[PDB]
Amino acid sequence: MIGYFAEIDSEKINQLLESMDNIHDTLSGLRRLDIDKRWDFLHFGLTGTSAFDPAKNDPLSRAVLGEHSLEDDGFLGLTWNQELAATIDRLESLDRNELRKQFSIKRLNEMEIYPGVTFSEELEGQLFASIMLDMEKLISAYRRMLRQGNHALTVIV
């Protein structure tokens, strides 16, 4: 289960919605930020929960999974161009020190965040830093999509 955030324009998303088995073909031609199997680390780092069990009405969960859950055999989420500015502002507003304070490698190991492997507790700082790097890559992707008039698709499958 790899995760990526794709950029889709209006004509293509409407075409997609007018029609997620073989989603990797309809999206095959779209630009994407691919974060391999680190998508749940990212979800956890921003929300304290797994994407497999998010808190109800969690805007930060939606910041990663998308404003709209089109599917959930792998997630497919959508965030309209009209919704990206808010998502971007939400992520840029986060206090990094705050996120770090909340991040616990012990909680991550216990909650069995995907892929479900344990980490030495000595890697807490490094893992967190790695997550912040993915968050920064996502922010840059969203900003590009917003500025170009496109929409975002979170694909996890």
Curated annotation (Swiss-Prot):
Pfam families per record: DUF1877 (PF08974)
Disulphide bridges: none
InterPro entries: DUF1877, YfbM-like_sf
Superkingdom, taxonomy of origin: Bacteria
Gene3D superfamilies in the cross-refs: YfbM-like super family
Transmembrane segments: none
Known partners and oligomeric status: Monomer.
The protein's name in its UniProt record: Protein YfbM
